[PDB]
Short mmCIF file of C-alpha atoms and ligand atoms in Angstrom, two decimals:
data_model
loop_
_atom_site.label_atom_id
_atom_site.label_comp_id
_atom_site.label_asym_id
_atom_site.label_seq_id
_atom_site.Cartn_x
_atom_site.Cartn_y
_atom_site.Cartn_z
CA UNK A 1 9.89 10.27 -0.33
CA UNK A 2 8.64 9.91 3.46
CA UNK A 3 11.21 8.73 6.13
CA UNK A 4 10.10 5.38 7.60
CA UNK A 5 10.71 5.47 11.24
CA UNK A 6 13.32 2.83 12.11
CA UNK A 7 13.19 0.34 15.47
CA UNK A 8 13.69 1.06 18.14
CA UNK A 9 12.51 4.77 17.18
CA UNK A 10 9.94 4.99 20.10
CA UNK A 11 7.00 6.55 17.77
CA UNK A 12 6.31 3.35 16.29
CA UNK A 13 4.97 2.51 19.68
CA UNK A 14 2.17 5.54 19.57
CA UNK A 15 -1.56 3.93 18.67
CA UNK A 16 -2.80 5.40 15.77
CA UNK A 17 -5.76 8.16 15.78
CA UNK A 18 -8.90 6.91 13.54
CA UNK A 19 -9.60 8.91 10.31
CA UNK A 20 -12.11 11.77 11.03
CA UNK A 21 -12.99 12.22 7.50
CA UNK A 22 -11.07 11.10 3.95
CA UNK A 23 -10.20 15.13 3.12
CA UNK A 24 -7.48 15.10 -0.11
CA UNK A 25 -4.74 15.81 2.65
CA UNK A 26 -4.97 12.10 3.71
CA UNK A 27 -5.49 11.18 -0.24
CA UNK A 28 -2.23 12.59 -0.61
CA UNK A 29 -0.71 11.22 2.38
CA UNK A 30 -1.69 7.91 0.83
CA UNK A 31 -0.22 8.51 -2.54
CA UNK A 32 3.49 9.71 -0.68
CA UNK A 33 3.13 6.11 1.28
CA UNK A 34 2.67 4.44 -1.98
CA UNK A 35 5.80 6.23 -3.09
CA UNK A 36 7.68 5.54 0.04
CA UNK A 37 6.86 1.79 -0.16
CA UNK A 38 7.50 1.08 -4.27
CA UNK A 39 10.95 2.96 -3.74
CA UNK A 40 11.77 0.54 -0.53
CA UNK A 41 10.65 -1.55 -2.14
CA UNK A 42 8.03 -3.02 0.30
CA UNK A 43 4.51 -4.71 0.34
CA UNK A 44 2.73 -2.76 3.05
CA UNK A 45 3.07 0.71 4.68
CA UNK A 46 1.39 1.73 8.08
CA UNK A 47 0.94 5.42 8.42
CA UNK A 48 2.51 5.11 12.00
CA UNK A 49 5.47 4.08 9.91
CA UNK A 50 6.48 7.88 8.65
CA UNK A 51 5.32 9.42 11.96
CA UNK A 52 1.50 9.93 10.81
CA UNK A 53 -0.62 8.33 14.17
CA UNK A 54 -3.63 7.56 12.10
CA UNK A 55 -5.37 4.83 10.88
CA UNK A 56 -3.90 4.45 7.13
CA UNK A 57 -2.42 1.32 5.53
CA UNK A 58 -1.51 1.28 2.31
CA UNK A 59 -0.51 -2.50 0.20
CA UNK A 60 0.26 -3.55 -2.84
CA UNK A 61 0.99 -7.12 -3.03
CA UNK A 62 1.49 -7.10 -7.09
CA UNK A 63 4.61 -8.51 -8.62
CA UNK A 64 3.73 -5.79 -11.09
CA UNK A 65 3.20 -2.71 -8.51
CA UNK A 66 -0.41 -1.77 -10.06
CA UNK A 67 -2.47 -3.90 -7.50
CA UNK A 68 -2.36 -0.75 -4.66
CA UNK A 69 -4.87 -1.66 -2.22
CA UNK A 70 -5.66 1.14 1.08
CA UNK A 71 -7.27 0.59 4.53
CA UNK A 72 -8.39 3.19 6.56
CA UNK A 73 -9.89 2.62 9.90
CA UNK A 74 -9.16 -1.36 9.76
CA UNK A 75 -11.06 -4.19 11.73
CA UNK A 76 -9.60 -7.23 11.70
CA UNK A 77 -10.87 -10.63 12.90
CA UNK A 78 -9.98 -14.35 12.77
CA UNK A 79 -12.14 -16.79 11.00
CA UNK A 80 -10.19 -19.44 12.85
CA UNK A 81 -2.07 -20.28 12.25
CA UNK A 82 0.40 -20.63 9.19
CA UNK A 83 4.09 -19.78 8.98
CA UNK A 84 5.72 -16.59 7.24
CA UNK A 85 8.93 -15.18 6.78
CA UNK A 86 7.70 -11.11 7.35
CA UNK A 87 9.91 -8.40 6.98
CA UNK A 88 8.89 -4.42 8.08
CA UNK A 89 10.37 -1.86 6.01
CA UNK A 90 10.73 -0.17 9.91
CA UNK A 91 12.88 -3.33 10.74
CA UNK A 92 15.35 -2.81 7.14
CA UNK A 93 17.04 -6.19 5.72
CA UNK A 94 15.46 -8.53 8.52
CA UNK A 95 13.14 -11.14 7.91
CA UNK A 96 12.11 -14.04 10.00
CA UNK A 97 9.15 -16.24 10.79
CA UNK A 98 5.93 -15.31 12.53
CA UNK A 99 2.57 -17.28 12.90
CA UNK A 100 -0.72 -16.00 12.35
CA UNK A 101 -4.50 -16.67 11.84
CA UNK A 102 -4.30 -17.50 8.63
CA UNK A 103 -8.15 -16.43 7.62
CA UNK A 104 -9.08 -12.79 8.57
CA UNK A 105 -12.12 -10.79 7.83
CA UNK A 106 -11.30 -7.06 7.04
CA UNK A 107 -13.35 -3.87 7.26
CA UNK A 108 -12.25 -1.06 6.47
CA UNK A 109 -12.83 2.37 4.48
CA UNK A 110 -10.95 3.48 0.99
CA UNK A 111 -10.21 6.37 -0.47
CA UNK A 112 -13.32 7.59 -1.63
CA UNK A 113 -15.03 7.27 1.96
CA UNK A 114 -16.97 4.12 0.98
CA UNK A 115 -16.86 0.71 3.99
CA UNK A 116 -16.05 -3.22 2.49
CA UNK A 117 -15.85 -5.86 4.09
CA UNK A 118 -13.49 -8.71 2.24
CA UNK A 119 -12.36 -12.26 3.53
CA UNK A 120 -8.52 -12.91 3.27
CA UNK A 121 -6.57 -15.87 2.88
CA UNK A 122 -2.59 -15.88 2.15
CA UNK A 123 -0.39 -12.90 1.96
CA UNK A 124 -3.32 -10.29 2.75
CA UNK A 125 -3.81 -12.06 5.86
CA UNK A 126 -0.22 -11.76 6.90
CA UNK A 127 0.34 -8.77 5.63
CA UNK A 128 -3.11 -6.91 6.91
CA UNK A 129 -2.39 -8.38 10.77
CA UNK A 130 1.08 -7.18 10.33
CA UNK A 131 0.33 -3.44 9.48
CA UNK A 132 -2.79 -3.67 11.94
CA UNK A 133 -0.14 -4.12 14.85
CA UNK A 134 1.74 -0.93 13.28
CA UNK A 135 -1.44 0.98 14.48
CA UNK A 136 -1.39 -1.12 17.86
CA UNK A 137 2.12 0.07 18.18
CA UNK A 138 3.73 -3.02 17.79
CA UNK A 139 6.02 -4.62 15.33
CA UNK A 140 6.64 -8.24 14.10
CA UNK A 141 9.81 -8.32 16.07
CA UNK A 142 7.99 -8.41 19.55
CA UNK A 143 7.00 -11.55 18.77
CA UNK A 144 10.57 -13.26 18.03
CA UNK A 145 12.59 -14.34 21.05
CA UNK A 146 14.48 -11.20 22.74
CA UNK A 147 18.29 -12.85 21.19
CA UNK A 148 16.84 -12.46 17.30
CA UNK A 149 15.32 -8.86 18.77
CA UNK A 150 18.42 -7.33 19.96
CA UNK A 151 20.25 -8.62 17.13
CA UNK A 152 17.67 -6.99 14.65
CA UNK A 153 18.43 -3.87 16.95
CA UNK A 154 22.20 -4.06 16.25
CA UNK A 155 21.91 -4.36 12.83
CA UNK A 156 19.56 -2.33 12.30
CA UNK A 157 21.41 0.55 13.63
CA UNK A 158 24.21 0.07 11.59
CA UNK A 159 21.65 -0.19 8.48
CA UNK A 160 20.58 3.38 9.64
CA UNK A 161 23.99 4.60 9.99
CA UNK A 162 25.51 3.34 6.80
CA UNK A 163 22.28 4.97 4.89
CA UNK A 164 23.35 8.20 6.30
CA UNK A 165 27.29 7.42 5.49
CA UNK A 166 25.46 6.98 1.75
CA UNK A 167 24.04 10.35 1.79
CA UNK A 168 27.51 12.10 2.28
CA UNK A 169 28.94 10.19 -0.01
ZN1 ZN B 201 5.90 -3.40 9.23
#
């Protein structure tokens, strides 16, 4: 399974490359990010996220975990805010509210090299703007007010450090 990158690791701040071509190397890449984000278990995985700068989401919002969904090269636009409570597998065991367009229009590529172009309402749109910003460097903490930020930073931490205390075990 890949290591997610953990805030405030500063490589979550790098911009992500675009995809020059969809070669079985990032096919695979894709399938290990599926892997890393059913085992979290999460929703959404940027590629930025286990220290790959390139434009690769992958998503699954299924109660089931047989919906997986990928987005290479992503556009995102508004069609127009609602409220969310977001987590970030690279922010562990935090959640809190942030507000977003709450209609998007994505393009993107998938797997096989082929473009759509889809309209999303509900969790995709909160979910697809918050692993967009993954490949803008930014995370969903940067918009919470700095107290709730270095808080998530303190805990955080100590999530990291009692995950390593678990591997010794
Ligand atoms: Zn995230």
């Amino acid at each position: 399974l890949l290591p997610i990158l953990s805030f405030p690791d500063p490589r979550l701040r790098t911009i992500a490359k675009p995809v020059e071509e969809v070669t079985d190397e990032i096919r695979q890449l894709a399938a290990d990010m599926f892997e890393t984000m059913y085992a979290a278990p999460g929703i959404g995985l940027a590629a930025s996220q286990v220290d790959r700068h390139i434009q690769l989401i992958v998503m699954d919002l299924s109660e089931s975990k047989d919906e997986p969904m990928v987005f290479i090269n992503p556009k995102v636009t508004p069609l127009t805010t609602q409220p969310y409570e977001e987590g970030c597998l690279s922010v562990p065991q935090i959640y809190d509210k942030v507000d977003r367009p709450s209609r998007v229009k994505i393009e993107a590529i998938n797997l096989e090299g082929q473009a759509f172009e889809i309209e999303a309402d509900g969790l995709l749109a909160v979910c697809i703007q918050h692993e967009m910003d993954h490949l803008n460097g930014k995370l969903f903490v940067d918009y919470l007010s700095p107290l709730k930020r270095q808080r998530a930073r303190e805990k955080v931490e100590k999530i990291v450090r009692q995950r390593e205390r678990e591997k010794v075990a």
